[PDB]
């Protein structure tokens, strides 16, 4: 039902080939867009039917540079305009010339903030037919409309049913309804011309009845079907006894609705908001995560791109590589651009070296995205991030991608520790030497139904197979991050530790081991190797069949400790008579 939007504006897609798939994965089946709705650079005959479910956009709606004749957003009721496209525009239709003929925004009755920008769309018929004044909410708005009528198109008059000649298209279903300019009294929204047709003040797009439960959409906030000004506090205050109290009916605020708990990758708070950020003077604490207040001076926080002093920084360079030293968790994104590995004659900044990237060796978690569009030719993989376990994707590239690999010479990913992509899409393309893409259990990394891998122009599977390039034979299900036994996701035999093996050295060998959860762990040094039998049952000196030297009950010992003890005829340590 709920998904996030994108952040491309009029920028070209990295992969025109997968651009349509991207939009589908992001928006298909969504009713609410927690972000901007951007439909740009579309081909003709595009399968846009997946957009039919959208009812609300939290941000702006941008449709640009599309050759499509129609965009199926008939169910769209509100463009809230939290963010606006350019000069305060909530809706922008640009350069759609192929090209749009109808708006078909039948359900669109409200814009809360911003104006409407429709320009250079030389097919569009009804951009100047819609009574935008009615659509704009009662509240003071710029409500600037820029309507380009240079359509160069012979358009049909609105259906006879469209009293007032207001329509979104040539059909009767395209007739525009009016919710404000037809109201009795001072009502912001109505079903009709009578006082009895007035909608509840908390209603936005209109209503089916007078109650706040009858709203088509909520103006301020949706609480489980009821439009209300606020989400019920988690903790309330007794003004008569001066005491705070827990509220059984309290809920968390997520976007514009109540939840019983914050959605995955979102932090809960004591004010009751779901956030992607932990406010200053607080800490992120696991249980499921929440943001807790610092009672004592806050711990060191490592930051990535997009955060703090790195907010305006495009990429990691030799100028800031050192800032990741000693970090396990980076609050922000990472990006490696051509400018990161090349030099900059302007700022006189040195290129990153292979040995400098090692600063990320200790990195386990990225809260943002990982964008790599450049990489040293001396590094056949991304193993410098081999210890990377989680990419949260709280910050997404272009508002969509949490993991992107473009134009790299890497043969395999090698990200063997990577077990979770909390959010966002993955894009791997134009990596003509990269084989181990389809060998990765991506379905095991994704958490949200809206996540998927997009890829193209990577090394052909046929070529990988032809050369015998594949996962290790001991690698379970053939799922691996690379060709080595150390890069496998799971082992069909023993894990050992970081290498698939046939067996542990239990019965044979000097450096004897024991089996523990399919791992191969060493026997205690004081343990005697058993030829043809089990050397030990564990790593402790009291878990061996026999001592390498002699006993110090219950443990094996090399030499007695100094209660000074000595090796007696028993073959064991005993308290000495000499003191």
């Amino acid at each position: 039902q709920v998904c996030t939007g994108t952040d491309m504006k009029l920028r070209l897609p990295a992969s025109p080939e997968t651009h349509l798939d991207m939009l589908r994965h992001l928006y298909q089946g969504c009713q609410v867009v927690q972000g901007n709705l951007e439909l740009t650079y579309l081909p003709t005959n595009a399968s846009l039917s997946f957009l039919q479910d959208i009812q609300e956009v939290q941000g702006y709606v941008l449709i640009a540079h599309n050759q499509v004749r129609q965009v199926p957003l008939q169910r769209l009721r509100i463009v809230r305009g939290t963010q606006l496209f350019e000069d305060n525009y909530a809706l922008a239709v640009l350069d759609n010339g192929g090209g749009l003929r109808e708006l078909q925004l039948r359900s669109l009755t409200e814009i809360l903030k911003g104006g409407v920008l429709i320009q250079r769309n030389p097919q569009l018929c009804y951009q100047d037919t819609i009574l935008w004044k009615d659509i704009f909410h009662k509240n003071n708005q710029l409500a600037l409309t820029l309507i380009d009528t240079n359509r160069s198109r012979a358009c049909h008059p609105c259906s006879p049913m469209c009293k007032g000649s207001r329509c979104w298209g040539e059909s009767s279903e395209d007739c525009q309804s009016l919710t404000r300019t037809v109201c009795a009294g001072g009502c912001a929204r109505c079903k009709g011309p009578l006082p009895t047709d007035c909608c509840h003040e908390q209603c936005a797009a209109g209503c089916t009845g007078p109650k706040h439960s009858d709203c088509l959409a909520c103006l301020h906030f949706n609480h489980s079907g009821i439009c209300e000004l606020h989400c019920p506090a988690l903790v309330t205050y007794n003004t008569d006894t001066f005491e705070s109290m827990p509220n059984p009916e309290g809920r968390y605020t997520f976007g514009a609705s109540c939840v019983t708990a914050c959605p995955y990758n979102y932090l809960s708070t004591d004010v009751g908001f779901c956030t992607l950020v932990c406010p200053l003077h607080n800490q992120e604490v696991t249980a499921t995560q929440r943001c807790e207040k610092c009672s004592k001076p806050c711990a060191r926080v490592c930051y990535g791109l997009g955060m703090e002093h790195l907010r305006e920084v495009r990429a990691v360079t030799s100028a800031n590589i050192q800032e990741f030293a000693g970090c396990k968790k980076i609050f922000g994104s990472l990006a490696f651009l051509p400018e990161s590995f090349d030099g900059d004659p302007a700022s006189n900044t040195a290129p990153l070296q292979p040995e400098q990237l090692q600063v990320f060796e200790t990195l386990e978690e990225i809260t943002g995205y990982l964008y790599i569009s450049a990489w040293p030719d001396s590094l056949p993989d991304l193993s410098v991030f081999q210890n990377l376990q989680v990419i949260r994707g709280r910050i997404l590239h272009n508002g969509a991608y949490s993991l992107t690999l473009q134009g790299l010479g890497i043969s395999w990913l090698g990200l063997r520790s990577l077990r979770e992509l909390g959010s966002g899409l993955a894009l791997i393309h134009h990596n003509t030497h990269l084989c181990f893409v389809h060998t990765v259990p991506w379905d095991q990394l994704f958490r949200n139904p809206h996540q998927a891998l997009l890829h193209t122009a990577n090394r052909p599977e046929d070529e990988c197979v032809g050369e015998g390039l594949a996962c290790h034979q001991l690698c379970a299900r053939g799922h691996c991050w690379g060709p080595g036994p150390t890069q496998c996701v799971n082992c069909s035999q023993f894990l050992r530790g970081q290498e698939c093996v046939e067996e542990c050295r239990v019965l044979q060998g000097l450096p004897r081991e024991y089996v523990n959860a399919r791992h191969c762990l060493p026997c205690h040094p004081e343990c005697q190797p058993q030829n043809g039998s089990v050397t030990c049952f564990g790593p402790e000196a009291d878990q061996c069949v026999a001592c390498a030297h002699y006993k110090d009950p219950p443990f094996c010992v090399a030499r007695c400790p100094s209660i000074w003890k000595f090796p007696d005829e028993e073959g064991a340590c005993q308290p000495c008579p000499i003191n």
Partner: antibody, heavy 120, light 108 residues
Framework: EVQLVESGGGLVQPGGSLRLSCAASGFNIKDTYIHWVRQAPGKGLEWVARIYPTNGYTRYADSVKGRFTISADTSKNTAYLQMNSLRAEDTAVYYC?????????????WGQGTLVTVSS | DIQMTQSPSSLSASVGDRVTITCRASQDVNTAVAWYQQKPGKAPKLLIYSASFLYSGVPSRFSGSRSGTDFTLTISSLQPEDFATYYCQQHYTTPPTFGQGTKVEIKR
């Protein structure tokens, strides 16, 4: 001598859990073997589990394997025993003890014990 | 799993009398046996370690010995204060194991 103080006892229902602790003073528990022993009413002593924080290895009695987890916090110098899936037969006084010294492996250090009652 | 059989489970002797408590290991455990004493309302305390050796802080009234798998705890002069349950425990294997336990009554 040393001071050993058990806590965490009280009443828990069957199928629930109870977390025992034992604070130490006079020595660093890190370097010794930490044991828990339990005594059911009318019964003798039953060895339960040990932790050896120096290397973090644990051992359990067959009677508690799969249910009890033993650990210690060397910064708090306090031993802990997490007992899950408790049943009525687990009613006992639980004692903490340590094997003080290097080559000395007998329970010279003892606390007082705390009663754990498991009942609906 | 080394078993320890302790006996007698009940002894009775007058004050000042000599009392011996024994236990038999199912295995030869050398001297890896300790004797513990639990007073009413108290945790078990250590008396004898390494079969025969007296632990510092323990009354000189106690001493032990070993013969094969048979261990003995001996008190040369039984006191009223020695009314407690005694345990024979092996510390040779893991787990450590206890015998049934022995009680000694003061004869009167």
């Amino acid at each position: 001598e040393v001071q050993l103080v058990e806590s965490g006892g009280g009443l828990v229902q069957p199928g629930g859990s109870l977390r025992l602790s034992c604070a130490a003073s006079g020595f660093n528990i890190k370097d010794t073997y930490i044991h828990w022993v339990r005594q059911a009413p009318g019964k003798g002593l039953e060895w339960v589990a040990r932790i050896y924080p120096t290397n973090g290895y644990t051992r359990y009695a067959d009677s508690v394997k799969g249910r009890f987890t033993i650990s210690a916090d060397t910064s708090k110098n306090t031993a802990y025993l997490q007992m899950n899936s408790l049943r009525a037969e687990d009613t006992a006084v639980y004692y903490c003890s340590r094997w003080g010294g290097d080559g000395f492996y007998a329970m010279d250090y003892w606390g007082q014990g705390t009663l754990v009652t498991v009942s609906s | 799993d080394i078993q320890m059989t302790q006996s007698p489970s009940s002894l009775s002797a007058s004050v000042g009398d000599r009392v011996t408590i024994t236990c038999r290991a199912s295995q030869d455990v050398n001297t890896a046996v300790a004797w513990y004493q639990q007073k009413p309302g108290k945790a078990p305390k250590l008396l004898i370690y390494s079969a025969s050796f007296l632990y510092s802080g323990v009354p000189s009234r106690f001493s032990g010995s070993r013969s094969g798998t048979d261990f003995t705890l001996t008190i040369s002069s039984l006191q009223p204060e020695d009314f407690a349950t005694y345990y024979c425990q092996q510390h040779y294997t893991t787990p450590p194991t206890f015998g049934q336990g022995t009680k000694v009554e003061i004869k009167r």
